[PDB]
From a paper:
HuR specifically recognizes adenine and uridine-rich elements (ARE) and uridine-rich sequences in 3′ untranslated regions (3′UTRs) of mRNAs. Hu/ELAV proteins share a common protein architecture with two consecutive RRMs, separated from the third RRM (RRM3) by a less conserved, flexible hinge region of variable length. Here, we report crystal structures of HuR RRM3 free and bound to U- and AU-rich RNAs.
Both RNAs were bound by RRM3, with a Kd of 156 μM and 19 μM, respectively. While in the structure of RRM3 with U6 and AU15, a uridine is recognized, in the case of AU6tnf RNA, an adenosine is bound in this pocket. On the 3′ end of the RNA, nucleotides in positions 5 and 6 are closer to the RRM3 β2β3 loop in case of the U6 ligand than when AU15 or AU6tnf are bound. The affected area correlates best with the dimeric interface found between chains A and B in the structures of RNA-bound RRM3 suggesting this is the dimerization interface in solution.
Author numbering: 243 to 325
The structure:
Amino acid sequence: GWCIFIYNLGQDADEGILWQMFGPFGAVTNVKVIRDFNTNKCKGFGFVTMTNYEEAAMAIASLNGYRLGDKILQVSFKTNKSH
Ligand code: NA
């Protein structure tokens, strides 16, 4: 699968948020959020695995810059490519 990185999630974001944002674009096999070891709030980082490259790309192009409540998300693949 293809790994998607989400940044700037708010403190209330959870796995269900990731499923509900990314599932509409295609098959999602895994989601994860990182939480603060001490507060258990979301730290702002999330990860999604999608099976199909073109659906991942559509999710990234659509969701990068998304306003999730009070926060503008950054969504990307790990590194860039010229083709
Ligand atoms: Na904790």
